[PDB]
Amino acid sequence: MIYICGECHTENEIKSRDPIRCRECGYRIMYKKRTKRLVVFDAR
Amino acid sequence: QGRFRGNLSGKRVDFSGRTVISPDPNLRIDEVAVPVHVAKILTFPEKVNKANINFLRK
Amino acid sequence: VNHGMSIDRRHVMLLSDLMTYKGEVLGITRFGLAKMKESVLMLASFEKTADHLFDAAY
Amino acid sequence: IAQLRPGQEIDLLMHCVKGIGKDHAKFSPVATASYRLLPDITLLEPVEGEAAEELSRCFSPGVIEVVARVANPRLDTFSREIFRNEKLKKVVRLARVRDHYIFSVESTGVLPPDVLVSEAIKVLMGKCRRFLDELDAV
Amino acid sequence: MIIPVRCFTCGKIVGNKWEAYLGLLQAEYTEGDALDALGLKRYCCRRMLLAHVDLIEKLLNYAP
Amino acid sequence: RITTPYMTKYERARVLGTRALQIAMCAPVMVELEGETDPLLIAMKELKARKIPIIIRRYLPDGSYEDWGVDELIIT
Amino acid sequence: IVQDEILAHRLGLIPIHADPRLFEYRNQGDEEGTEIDTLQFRLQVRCTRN
Amino acid sequence: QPSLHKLSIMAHLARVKPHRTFRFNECVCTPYNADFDGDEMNLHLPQTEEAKAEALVLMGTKANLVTPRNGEPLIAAIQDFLTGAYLLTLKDTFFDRAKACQIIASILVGKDEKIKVRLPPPTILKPVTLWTGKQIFSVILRPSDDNPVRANLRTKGKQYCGKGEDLCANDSYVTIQNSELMSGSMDKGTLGSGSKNNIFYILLRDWGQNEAADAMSRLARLAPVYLSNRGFSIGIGDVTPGQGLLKAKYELLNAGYKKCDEYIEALNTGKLQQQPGCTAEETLEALILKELSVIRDHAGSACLRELDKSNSPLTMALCGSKGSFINISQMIACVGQQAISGSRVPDGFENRSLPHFEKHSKLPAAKGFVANSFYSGLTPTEFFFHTMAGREGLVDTAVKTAETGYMQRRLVKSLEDLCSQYDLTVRSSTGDIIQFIYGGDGLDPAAMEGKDEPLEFKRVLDN
Amino acid sequence: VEEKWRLLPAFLKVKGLVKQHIDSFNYFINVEIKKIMKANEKVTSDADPMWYLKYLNIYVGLPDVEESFNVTRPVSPHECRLRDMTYSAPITNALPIGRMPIMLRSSNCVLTGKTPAEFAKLNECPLDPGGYFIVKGVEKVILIQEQLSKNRIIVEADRKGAVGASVTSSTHEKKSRTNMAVKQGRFYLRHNTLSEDIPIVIIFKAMGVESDQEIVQMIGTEEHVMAAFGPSLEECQKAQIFTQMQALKYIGNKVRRARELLASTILTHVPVKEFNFRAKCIYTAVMVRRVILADRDYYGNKRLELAGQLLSLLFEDLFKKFNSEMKKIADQVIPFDVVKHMRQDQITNGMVNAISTGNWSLKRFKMDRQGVTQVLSRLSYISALGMMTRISSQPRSLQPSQWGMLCPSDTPEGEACGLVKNLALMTHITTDMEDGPIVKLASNLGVEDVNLLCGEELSYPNVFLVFLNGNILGVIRDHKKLVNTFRLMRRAGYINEFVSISTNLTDRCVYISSDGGRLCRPYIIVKKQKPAVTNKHMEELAQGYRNFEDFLHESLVEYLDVNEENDCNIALYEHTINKDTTHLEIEPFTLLGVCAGLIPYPHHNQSPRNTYQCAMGKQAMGTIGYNQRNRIDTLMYLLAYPQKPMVKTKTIELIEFEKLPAGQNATVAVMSYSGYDIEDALVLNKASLDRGFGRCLVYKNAKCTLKRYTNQTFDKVMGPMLDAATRKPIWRHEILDADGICSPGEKVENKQVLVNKSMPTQYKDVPITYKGATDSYIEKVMISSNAEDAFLIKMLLRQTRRPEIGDKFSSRHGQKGVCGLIVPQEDMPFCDSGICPDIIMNPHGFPSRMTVGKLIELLAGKAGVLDGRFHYGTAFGGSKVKDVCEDLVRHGYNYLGKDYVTSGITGEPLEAYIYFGPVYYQKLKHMVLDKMHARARGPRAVLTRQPTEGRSRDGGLRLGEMERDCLIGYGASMLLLERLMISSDAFEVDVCGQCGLLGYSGWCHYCKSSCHVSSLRIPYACKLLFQELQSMNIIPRLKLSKYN
RNA sequence: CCCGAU
Ligand SMILES: [Mg+2]
Ligand SMILES: [Zn+2]
Ligand SMILES: [Zn+2]
Ligand SMILES: [Zn+2]
């Protein structure tokens, strides 16, 4: 599990039941990394 | 809101849908164009009566 | 006819003849329905649902 | 295609297919493929004496000569400014030839426009030979 | 957002005429004859540059 | 014998109402039908051929009645 | 920051100089392509600071 | 969902199309009171086979073509079809066998594809041969050869010529003989909803209801195919006043203002005669309104004289498709006095309508008169008074439906349990007689002809 | 004379739009919290009188948030929008009291002063109005309420001339309504504490003026109708021998449910008395004076209570509840901060709960104003700015006193056709002030009261009596000197600019109003026929070498409220200046709001067609802010390629609407085509929609939070259940990503699971699934703690919809239209130069609606694109047609715009010319995918067993009782049994023959004999009627019969 | 309850 900070944008490997703070920040808005699967789109 | 004026007379109804309307002059005055997705949901129980046996099997 | 709005007289010949057929002119209010109808649920589906149901149980 | 800021990626494969333009307009081989009938403008009355240069600025610029002569009619956009003049509108009838038009093909660049037209005729002929072979079956 | 790469009515390729248009407006070129330099004859392909706003340089600021 | 000899629109509706529901329960059909699978479309073929096994019981509001065969009526 | 479909739609409107009538139509669904029907393109852009 | 009359629920046959909108023919939209501006409407589906026939027979559109208030037809052409068929049956149109077989062959789909459509012989033969417009409108009433419809109708029209029965050059006098339009042009009053002498009402009574619904579903297919290839279009050239209006409106605004300056001055400075209604400063305003409505209607007549034919809002007003001649005078010439609930606008400030005018000013353009038309654009005081008079329309529809919704409810909660019994008497639910025959004659108001008479014998004998 | 419009962009920088929300709150923070401490110092208790708690000051700091013991970190407002917190700052020896939320762009918010570069790191849009609190994550506005004035002698017409002054106690504890009635020709003083309509001369003798000569001298010395005060009451007073002052308190001393010297202070309050009642008598006498000489909706009477005035109604009450509970504690533990820190819950969860649930439930002021706050509508940009300038009422018709203050055309329709107004551009609501220098100049300029003989203030012309804020302050012989001298003084700047002196000559009362809450507006002063702006001033403002507030002190611009506008001669333009002009008008397009004003040429349309757009302008679908991608809101509509309009107005530039527009501008060609455009419908083409004309972006939002319970167990987000392989469920846990939360950048079908929120009862999983109808792609997934730190997780679902059949477009003139048909491009009437249209519009929308302003946008737009220019069509001005039309001629076009087309289908040219050009078509948020609905057979409601209400709950739409009568009138009997018993409530019940009552199943419990019990067939709702009738004592005893 | 649709 790798999450991206609010504005620091550092990948922070947290685990479960862990506060969502950040390395090099304290900001608690952590988005998730984009998926790894082949996503098919239609140009219509 | 009570049972008389809203649950005994004006009661909600199954097999009923609601969309936005748009014109179609290419229909006869007696016909409404119904979308496919609605027409696959609203169903009519047609009993099987020796004339719609092959039609309902199909 | 003052407001445009043409109408058959046979509709007004019915509304007047209902309104005055039990003796006196019975205006179509909540009160005139009690003097027009005998059945309770037709009165009870109209206004004053509380009193019309208890009084017809009395 | 898109704009980026540092740390951002775009990674994608594409698939191209052969599509009719009426399926979706991204398959359209031509920007505009319109046509217009060639106009011809006949001065019924001879015009001269400063009404000619009045009729010059009335039309499209290149169309006219100055007496008044309708020098080259093909360049006329139909502003229809004559009818604002109230004097020359009785003088000249404006008209367009029916069986003489002007095509104007401008390709997007897939095929050169002299091969777009010769393909356009080629599939109309194929659309009617597709039907003439239906009657040969029946 | 970003410049739509077609005209909506005719479909002239107009997405490649944005930074070439902004490069013209950086110079003296008036709003009118800048689009005559890019080969935009009819007005429907002319409004795709004229009436367009470029939010994508502004959204990028708020997208680290 | 005293009511209207015209089949009203409320009698044509219910005669087509119940002859449709009868023929949708495998009733015997009277019109040697030609591929109509909607039971309602069979019933209008029954009405126009004037073969419907139904007698309308018309109630005068005093309580007396007056029968009327659907053969014996003037449809529109 | 450009959305996925709007990117995928804006890749659609780009014309492609490979002429047709070398290729044929896509018969089935056939999302794999058969190199007689399709023509693949790659786009890999990752920007940094200079 | 705001069901206001019997025609808001109607049955329809259902054809599964490819979209998510409920699409119906636009002739049946005035019974629903349904425009297509984002309106939604519900679709119930009856389950038992008995409730399927009760929808089809009683509530079908082929049965309820006619509203039960008057007997008028509600399902008839709206908007474009009326202004399509007026522009087609107008005297000037002529089609060659190119366009004639193209407009006619539009009417060949969907129960109509199996008829040998008979083009009538053309009405010009020798110098060029070509059809006329009205001869193609006759193909709507009788497309085949073996069609049994012979429609007959003779009536007046809008912009009626006044003198002359059918022979005057204005040509607003319809005469159909045996479903062939012989003279006249199809107005709203000969095709639309509300008139008891349009053809779809005449085809209903005389020839069954299947031929009226077919001839109405023929016109809805035919008239756009003509109009989309004829190109009826509005523009701002259709709103600009010519030269003749401006010199007419300028004098009418001056000579209409000299007198109202004197009629005000004849009141306060001296002695003014009084109308019998009230005192001064009440009949002054009623004499102001007479001279201002002189202005907006003479300029409204100055507009209509110079307005060239084939003007688009004029053509939409001759046939009554959309907007009368009042709207053309408002758009072009001059929109008149803006009235609030039947008077000049009341002073919201002290003795003054807006603080731009003077105190106790009874002047025009200070108590609600707007001088500029919508083309030349309203001015800020004029735009405010038009807004003030405009909101009384919007406010009253909010409060009327708050009352007539209740008045619909009290009415139907007393009057619901009456039905004309089989011995022609109309009784209550309890057996008590209200009427001995329904309405004296026992006659449907729905089937009733105009004048509250079932026949109108002049029409039937000529038919 | 040429350029005076420049005063408006200088006014908007200072105090114009959404700055009246802010200044009102900035007054509330920086003044009103220090005027409640002066009212509520000295917390004393009786159980110990030797201690005292005395507040010195309250400071309200910067917004902060703690997540632990003492981190105390600050917050940006677009973090509270994500973490569902509440953007608030602490309230404060020097110890905290509570926390109060701060509206954005306030004096203590973070966003003020900072550059657009710093708005990025705070993740906030610079083109964002502010004036909205962020409470519990959502963003609420306090809507401007309008109340009637305070202590106003209103002369109504209940039966004949009743007058009631709704006095509001400056000591705000109560608000009483001491109205005065006339019964059979006699005056009375009805109150709500009085048990009897007592005659007024009873009051007058109770008020100290005992003799009857004085009372008439008060009411009328000139007798002509005030003699008919005589045999009314002072005879009726004298008819019972009751001439005595003490005895006439005694009749009051009975009915008031010696003891009434005090209780006459709770009657006509704000006239002050120190047991010298002479000031009270004249104010009652003037109230009688009106009646014998004898507008509720007129905007000199309507004062507006803003967001900062309305919070001071709350915080004073919440401070008192904090205050009185200190007395309840100090009287509990004495027979002190440490018993106060738990009352940080009192203010904070008191203030926040009043904004989120919009309820001032204040029993202390007896007011229960419901729905004061509203969630912001972030549909477009102007649907946010159209909420900031909004006024809710407590009549429907437009009054002309709203000229210049409110928008005439911006209103809803329906329930609120004239009850929800919108502020215009150049307005300003006033704040309160002190009344010191107003009185100090009043008593110098000449006034005298309480020494003047009763007779003076009467029909004599030179007795204009000065009234300030509703309290009489003397009488002046010469009204003109007073009105003129105050006005010169205000212009000079000695008196506050906002105060207004107005004079009513019908009743001689001048009216100095320093009320605060008055609707105000600026005008250019016209001394003699030359105005005061002088152009050169309009040039100073050009370089900035001067500011709009320098115009005020130079006596060039005057603020006028509605009351002063009775006394002025406002000239609209320069050329309408008269001999007695008084004030002039700055820029006359400012009478329109901000939702109208967007319209080009509103002065050419019929006026009920601008009003349709003011609703649809808020419904537009466009861009929201520059932070529109970082916002995770519940429903956010975005356009793919917005375009600024070709015909802009002038209000569009001041709002900077073109900086973030809404809607494209498509080349329409108004003509009738194919008959699929009949009732306002409009044909699009299937090439522009393939080229991206108005592609939608509808962004939903699903969320969950994982709370730790009191059981000390918590929620889990355990990953997918792989079955027989690493592959996840058949499609159910396919997008989960193995951390629980679904993966961003992936599509979600129907009934696919977003998170596995599992709950402790032992774990029952409550999977948060995405319902929808169509698929949606995850764009962002945010993970945070809320205030009570419980791991909230927020999704964000893309969806793009090309506009297909059904999708409502409007046309910037209120001519909205569902897109009836989408033809291919090659079937569409191309003109000569090749331009096929996008949106064929029907020409029948024009001659009935008379929207001529649309017909000029096809002209001003078409000349605009051809010249490379944006044509101003503002209100009451802009580019005229006689110069636009001669610009088409230079580019070789028709001078009306009607271009010769040839038809696409048949190939021959069209018989008539077709109007043609670009007009601004804005797509709006009524797309048919959100409204397509059908219910075959689904959930029934648990109580009444009918189908549920709503499409979110799988629907069923109410065949109402109005449609019951339609089904009655057709005579369809068997339909109604099918439609209201068979397919709604198909129930089956058992009753018995004898004693007929509902007995369950096979036998009836009453009379156990089981033999008579015979089943019925009934709707369930009727069975629930019988069973709830029988619950009370009404017993429907059914008596069955067999089918005959 | 608000909002919004008609
Ligand atoms: Mg509507
Ligand atoms: Zn960080
Ligand atoms: Zn183009
Ligand atoms: Zn029993």
Q: For the residues of I175-201, what is the DSSP string, one character each?
A: B--EEE-EETTEEB---SSBSS--BHH
Q: Which of A39, A40, A43 faces G9 most closely, judged by CB atoms?
A: A43
How far apart (Å, rounded) are the C-alpha atoms in residues H8 and H29? 10
Chains in touch with D (3+ beta-carbon pairs under 8 Å) read A, E, G, I
Nucleotide nearest to H2 (CA to C1'): J6
Nearest one of I258, I242, I262 to I250, comparing CA atoms: I258
Chain D partners of G12 at a C-beta cutoff of 8 Å?
24, 26
Say if residues I521 and I429 touch (Cβ distance below 8 Å): no
Distance A28 CA to ligand 2 centre (A): 8
Q: Which of G3, G6, G13 faces I691 most closely, judged by CB atoms?
A: G13
Span CA (F65) to C1' (J4), Å: 57
In H105-209, alpha helices (H): 133-141, 199-207
DSSP assignments along D97-126, one per residue: EEEEEEE--EE-SSS-HHHHHHHHHHHHHH
Domain ranges of chain F: 1-76
How far apart (Å, rounded) are the C-alpha atoms in residues I757 and I702? 13
The three state secondary structure string of I300-312 is: CCEEEECHHHHHH
Chain H partners of C17 at a C-beta cutoff of 8 Å?
434-435
Residue among C46, C47, C53 with most chain I CBs within 10 A, to mutate: C53
The total number of structural domains that make up chain A: 1
Chains C and H touch (3+ CB pairs under 8 A): yes
Distance H37 CA to ligand 1 centre (A): 5
Please name every residue paired with I760 in a beta bridge, in sequence order, or none if there are none: I763
Q: Which nucleotides of J are covered by protein (CB under 7 A)?
A: 1-6
- I169 contact partners, CB below 8 Å, separation of at least 6: I175, I176, I269, I270
Please name every residue paired with D12 in a beta bridge, in sequence order, or none if there are none: G43
Q: CA of B33: which chain H residue's CA is closest?
A: H23
What the block records as the tokens of H359 is 């105190």
How far apart (Å, rounded) are the C-alpha atoms in residues I71 and I82? 20
Strand I465-468 vs strand I509-513: parallel, antiparallel, or unpaired? parallel
Nearest one of I795, I715, I799, I792 to I754, comparing CA atoms: I795
Kindly tell me the sign of the dihedral angle through the C-alpha atoms of H430, H431, H432, H437. positive
The distance of H73 to chain C (nearest Cα, Å) reads 13
- Eight-class DSSP state of F66: E
What the block records as the tokens of A39 is 């996503």
Q: CA of C53: which chain B residue's CA is closest?
A: B4
Is there contact between H35 and strand J, defined as CB under 7 Å from any strand atom?
A: yes
Q: Residues of A numbered 4-43 whose beta carbons fall under 8 angstroms of chain G's beta carbons: which are they?
A: 39-43
How far apart (Å, rounded) are the C-alpha atoms in residues H187 and H172? 8
Distance I608 CA to ligand 1 centre (A): 15
Is there contact between I359 and strand J, defined as CB under 7 Å from any strand atom?
A: no
**Unique residue bearing structure tokens 């309408």:** I576
Nearest one of I839, I822, I829 to I899, comparing CA atoms: I829
DSSP assignments along I809-867, one per residue: E--SSS--EE---EE-GGGS--BSSS---S-BPPTTHHHHH--HHHHHHHHHHHHHHHH
- CA H103 to mean position of chain CA atoms: 26
Is residue I869 part of an annotated ligand binding site? no
Experimental determination approach used? cryo-EM
What the block records as the tokens of I434 is 């002190």
Chain H partners of C32 at a C-beta cutoff of 8 Å?
414
Ligand nearest to the CA of I998: 4
Q: Which of H69, H415, H434 faces C8 most closely, judged by CB atoms?
A: H69
Q: Which residues surround ligand 3, an ion (CB under 5 A)?
A: E 7, 9-10, 12, 44-45
* C44 and chain H in contact, CB less than 8 A: no
In I834-977, alpha helices (H): 845-849, 852-867, 881-888, 961-969, 973-977
The CA dihedral of H191, H196, H202, H205, to the nearest 10 degrees, is 140
Nearest one of I572, I404, I546, I564 to I491, comparing CA atoms: I564
Say if residues I962 and I1002 touch (Cβ distance below 8 Å): no
Chains B and H touch (3+ CB pairs under 8 A): yes
How far apart (Å, rounded) are the C-alpha atoms in residues I280 and I302? 25
Q: Residues of A numbered 11-40 whose beta carbons fall under 8 angstroms of chain I's beta carbons: which are they?
A: 16-17, 19-20, 26-35, 37, 39
Is residue E7 part of an annotated ligand binding site? yes
- CA I793 to mean position of chain CA atoms: 32
What the block records as the tokens of I446 is 């000449």
The distance of D32 to chain G (nearest Cα, Å) reads 15
Q: Which residues of H178-204 are buried (b: 16+ CB within 10 A; e: fewer)?
A: ebbbebbbbbbbbbbbbbbbbbbbbbb
The residue type at H51: A
The residue type at I830: F
How far apart (Å, rounded) are the C-alpha atoms in residues I309 and I300? 19
How far apart (Å, rounded) are the C-alpha atoms in residues A39 and B2? 52
Nucleotide nearest to I387 (CA to C1'): J3
* F43 and chain B in contact, CB less than 8 A: no
Nearest one of H332, H300, H73 to H188, comparing CA atoms: H73
F11 phi, psi to nearest 5 deg = -85, -35
How far apart (Å, rounded) are the C-alpha atoms in residues I853 and I592? 16
Span CA (I372) to C1' (J1), Å: 11
Strand J proximity: list residues 487-526 of I with CB under 7 Å: none
Is there contact between H2 and strand J, defined as CB under 7 Å from any strand atom?
A: yes
Structural domain range at position A16 = 1-44
- CA B26 to mean position of chain CA atoms: 21
Strand I957-958 vs strand I782-784: parallel, antiparallel, or unpaired? unpaired
How far apart (Å, rounded) are the C-alpha atoms in residues I762 and H1? 49
Nearest one of I942, I799, I640 to E52, comparing CA atoms: I640
How far apart (Å, rounded) are the C-alpha atoms in residues H405 and I960? 13
Span CA (I359) to C1' (J2), Å: 12
How far apart (Å, rounded) are the C-alpha atoms in residues I723 and I579? 93
The residue type at F57: R
How far apart (Å, rounded) are the C-alpha atoms in residues I685 and I661? 23
Span CA (H368) to C1' (J6), Å: 32
B41 phi, psi to nearest 5 deg = -100, -55
Span CA (C4) to C1' (J2), Å: 40
Distance I668 CA to ligand 3 centre (A): 13
Strand H22-24 vs strand B16-23: parallel, antiparallel, or unpaired? parallel
The distance of C28 to chain H (nearest Cα, Å) reads 7
- G33 contact partners, CB below 8 Å, separation of at least 6: D15, G40
Is there contact between H42 and strand J, defined as CB under 7 Å from any strand atom?
A: no
Nucleotide nearest to I379 (CA to C1'): J4
Chain I partners of F13 at a C-beta cutoff of 8 Å?
971-972
How far apart (Å, rounded) are the C-alpha atoms in residues H151 and H200? 10
- Eight-class DSSP state of B17: E
The distance of E16 to chain G (nearest Cα, Å) reads 10
Give the angle H169-H175-H176 at the CA atoms, nearest 5°: 140
Query: Nearest residue to nucleotide J3 when comparing alpha carbons to its C1'?
Result: I374
How far apart (Å, rounded) are the C-alpha atoms in residues I855 and I506? 49
How far apart (Å, rounded) are the C-alpha atoms in residues D3 and E2? 9
How far apart (Å, rounded) are the C-alpha atoms in residues F23 and I26? 80
- I518 contact partners, CB below 8 Å, separation of at least 6: I300, I303, I304, I429, I430, I498, I500, I561, I562, I563
How far apart (Å, rounded) are the C-alpha atoms in residues E64 and A4? 11
Gyration radius of chain A over CA positions = 14
- CA I475 to mean position of chain CA atoms: 41
Distance I124 CA to ligand 2 centre (A): 18
Distance I653 CA to ligand 3 centre (A): 28
How far apart (Å, rounded) are the C-alpha atoms in residues F24 and B48? 7
Residue I353's SS3 state is helix
Residue I234's SS3 state is helix
Strand I914-915 vs strand I703-705: parallel, antiparallel, or unpaired? unpaired
- Quickly count helices (H) and strands (E) in chain F: 2, 2
I637 phi, psi to nearest 5 deg = -100, 130
Chains G and C touch (3+ CB pairs under 8 A): no
Annotated catalytic sites of I, by residue?
680
Distance E22 CA to ligand 3 centre (A): 20
The CA dihedral of I386, I391, I396, I402, to the nearest 10 degrees, is -90
How far apart (Å, rounded) are the C-alpha atoms in residues E35 and E20? 10
- Eight-class DSSP state of H438: G
